Amino acid sequence: VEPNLHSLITSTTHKWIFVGGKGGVGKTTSSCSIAIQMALSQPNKQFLLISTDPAHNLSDAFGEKFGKDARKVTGMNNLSCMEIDPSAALKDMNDLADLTGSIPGIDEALSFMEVMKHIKRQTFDTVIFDTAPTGHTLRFLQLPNTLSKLLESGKLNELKANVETIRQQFTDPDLTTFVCVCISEFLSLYETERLIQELISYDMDVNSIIVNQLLFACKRCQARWKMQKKYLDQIDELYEDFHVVKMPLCAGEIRGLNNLTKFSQFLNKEYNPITDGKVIYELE
Amino acid sequence: VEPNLHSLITSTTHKWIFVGGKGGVGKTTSSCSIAIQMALSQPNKQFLLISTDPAHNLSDAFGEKFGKDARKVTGMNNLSCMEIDPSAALKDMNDMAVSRGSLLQGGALADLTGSIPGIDEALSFMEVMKHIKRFDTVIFDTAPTGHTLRFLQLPNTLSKLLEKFGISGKLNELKANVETIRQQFTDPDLTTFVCVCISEFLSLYETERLIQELISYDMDVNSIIVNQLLFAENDQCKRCQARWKMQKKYLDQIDELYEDFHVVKMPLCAGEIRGLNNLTKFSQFLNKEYNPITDGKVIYELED
Ligand SMILES: Nc1ncnc2c1ncn2[C@@H]1O[C@H](COP(=O)(O)OP(=O)(O)O)[C@@H](O)[C@H]1O
Ligand SMILES: Nc1ncnc2c1ncn2[C@@H]1O[C@H](COP(=O)(O)OP(=O)(O)O)[C@@H](O)[C@H]1O
Ligand code: ALF
Ligand code: ALF
Ligand SMILES: [Mg+2]
Ligand SMILES: [Mg+2]
Ligand SMILES: [Zn+2]
Numbered sequence A: 001v002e003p004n005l006h007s008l009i010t011s012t013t014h015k016w017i018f019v020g021g022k023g024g025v026g027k028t029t030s031s032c033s034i035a036i037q038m039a040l041s042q043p044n045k046q047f048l049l050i051s052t053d054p055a056h057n058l059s060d061a062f063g064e065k066f067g068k069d070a071r072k073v074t075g076m077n078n079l080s081c082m083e084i085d086p087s088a089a090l091k092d093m094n095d096l097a098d099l100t101g102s103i104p105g106i107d108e109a110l111s112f113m114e115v116m117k118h119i120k121r122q123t124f125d126t127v128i129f130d131t132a133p134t135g136h137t138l139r140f141l142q143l144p145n146t147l148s149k150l151l152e153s154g155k156l157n158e159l160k161a162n163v164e165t166i167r168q169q170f171t172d173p174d175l176t177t178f179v180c181v182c183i184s185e186f187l188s189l190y191e192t193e194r195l196i197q198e199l200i201s202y203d204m205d206v207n208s209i210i211v212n213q214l215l216f217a218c219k220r221c222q223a224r225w226k227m228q229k230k231y232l233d234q235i236d237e238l239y240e241d242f243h244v245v246k247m248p249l250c251a252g253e254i255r256g257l258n259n260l261t262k263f264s265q266f267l268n269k270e271y272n273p274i275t276d277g278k279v280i281y282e283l284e
Numbered sequence B: 001v002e003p004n005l006h007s008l009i010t011s012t013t014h015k016w017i018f019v020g021g022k023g024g025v026g027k028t029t030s031s032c033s034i035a036i037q038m039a040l041s042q043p044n045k046q047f048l049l050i051s052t053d054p055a056h057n058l059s060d061a062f063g064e065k066f067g068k069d070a071r072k073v074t075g076m077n078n079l080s081c082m083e084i085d086p087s088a089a090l091k092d093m094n095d096m097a098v099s100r101g102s103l104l105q106g107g108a109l110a111d112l113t114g115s116i117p118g119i120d121e122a123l124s125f126m127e128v129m130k131h132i133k134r135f136d137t138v139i140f141d142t143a144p145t146g147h148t149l150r151f152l153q154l155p156n157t158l159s160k161l162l163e164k165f166g167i168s169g170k171l172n173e174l175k176a177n178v179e180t181i182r183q184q185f186t187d188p189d190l191t192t193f194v195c196v197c198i199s200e201f202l203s204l205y206e207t208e209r210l211i212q213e214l215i216s217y218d219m220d221v222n223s224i225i226v227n228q229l230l231f232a233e234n235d236q237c238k239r240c241q242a243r244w245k246m247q248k249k250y251l252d253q254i255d256e257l258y259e260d261f262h263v264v265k266m267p268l269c270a271g272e273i274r275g276l277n278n279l280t281k282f283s284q285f286l287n288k289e290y291n292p293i294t295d296g297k298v299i300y301e302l303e304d
Helices: A027-041 A058-062 A086-093 A106-120 A134-151 A154-170 A186-201 A219-238 A256-268 A273-283 B027-041 B058-062 B086-099 B109-113 B119-133 B145-163 B168-185 B201-216 B238-257 B276-287 B292-300
Strands: A016-021 A047-051 A079-083 A126-130 A176-183 A206-214 A243-248 B016-020 B047-051 B079-083 B137-141 B191-198 B223-229 B262-267
Touching: A016 A027, A016 A134, A016 A186, A027 A047, A027 A058, A027 A079, A027 A126, A027 A176, A027 A206, A027 A256, A058 A079, A058 A256, A058 B201, A086 A106, A106 A126, A106 A134, A106 A154, A106 B145, A134 A154, A134 A186, A134 B109, A134 B119, A176 A186, A186 A206, A186 A219, A186 B058, A206 A219, A219 A243, A219 B238, A219 B292, A243 A256, A256 A273, A273 B238, B016 B027, B016 B145, B027 B047, B027 B058, B027 B079, B027 B137, B027 B191, B027 B223, B027 B276, B047 B119, B058 B079, B058 B276, B086 B109, B086 B119, B119 B145, B119 B168, B145 B168, B145 B201, B191 B201, B201 B238, B223 B238, B238 B262, B262 B276, B262 B292
Parallel strands: A016 A126, A016 A176, A047 A079, A047 A126, A176 A206, A206 A243, B016 B137, B016 B191, B047 B079, B047 B137, B191 B223, B223 B262
Antiparallel strands: none
């Protein structure tokens, strides 16, 4: 099973791609990267990257301002981002809205409504979700089942049909898949294993794991690599049947289309220290 | 404004302490560390560390099992942990309703509602109200920023929806409990929010936005822990030197921006920080500031 996401990046069937895992592991960095690789690789198709983390970071990552209305990434012809602000969205729908935009769960509700509107309206060929950390993303992926059972007039029936339709698409391995991102450390590895078990139980396809921030080894770096390697061995045993993609810690943060594009190549053809080592240092 | 949490750790008024920030910055590591520093220096008080992150890591961090019910940290007399379990709580509520209402009648409350987004914040909040109704200090190991903001808006949000309410008794009592929590969270002597961050663009700007949000909720925030620092000019690795250049850039901005805050600088250690011993070792630097010249050896002193 190839150690890269080339199969996903060139997929001709996938409509919904979730990128998830523990906090700070690189979900935003990776979902920007997957979205860039897909857009470059399939010029004919139109891609949306939507952040369902209420503390959005797509604008921070690209260095340009996104919002509830999809906008093209400057420099791309076929990649767009969206960051929904619930109180802004509600304030528009209402035309108390504002109080509602502050209720726990409103973020997931509006993100789901965005999915339904792409169902109803059928714009973008593929949607990539840069998700909130693990715990709240599981709640989001359960929404189709949840709404189904709760609902269980013509507009209520309309809501019902649409959620059943999402439930069916989300559980179709050709249409929907979840890419896990993790770091090779105890707290991340165990959280990721719990997440994968839960996803399998939801009948959601999960076939890929990005292991990010690897040192591939300064005494501090030598000790930290020794640790990463121990958990990396475990990841190899556990996830033998998965695409496991090993990504390096770079010499600086990864921001802007240029640097994100440069990092994203290694999701497509896997990082090789022999041939690619200099690249880590171009991010300073 | 001393670059440490000594005022907070030795405080005799604080009842509610929130530790929050962007994903993966070290909230759980720092909240365990703050709680241990407090428990150790206030032996006569009793502390509860509660994780409101639905993906809990307190058991992972100490390396032993916690749950819905508080349990002492092995090796501490003074500190307890709890990891709130939503489905479990709903299940017991449903069981007790049946055994002494459409959602309850068919015994499926947990099934129907255990997965509704927002349910974790709802139950975490119920948990808060219980310590109100009847541990001296509670430290919250919070979920990442976005959902924690929703949690912290909740008492103030409920107060206003309820205001428009205008078993009705339970709603009345909820309204009353909401008001006192709301009262206590805006009391700078009873509650404070400790921000945690790493010295990188995404974390810095998320933190800046978070703190501006908290201030508008009248929640006290006067502390920022800057975690995972390399301090590469102490001792002598190309990657570390370049990364330190990045970090130092953002640190200079943090020191300027948060001149009136306790900004507490913590080193990246040579391994993950797990178990009472390693957390305790790491935690001394919240109380007395880390000095890379003198304290540098500590990053290699973690037990396995
Ligand atoms: N492999 C990497 N090398 C260097 N910096 C990285 C790498 N992956 C992520 N980052 C940086 O790490 C921090 C966290 O990444 P982020 O994508 O925000 O994670 P998450 O979305 O899971 O919170 C950010 O500052 C990001 O720029
Ligand atoms: N200063 C540090 N040095 C080394 N490892 C650290 C440090 N702070 C946190 N960690 C490790 O970094 C990862 C994320 O920390 P964690 O406390 O889980 O963050 P958060 O709770 O904000 O998600 C964990 O593997 C933890 O052991
Ligand atoms: F990734 Al975390 F608390 F576990 F932000
Ligand atoms: F901290 Al994140 F996505 F921004 F987990
Ligand atoms: Mg993110
Ligand atoms: Mg945590
Ligand atoms: Zn190094």
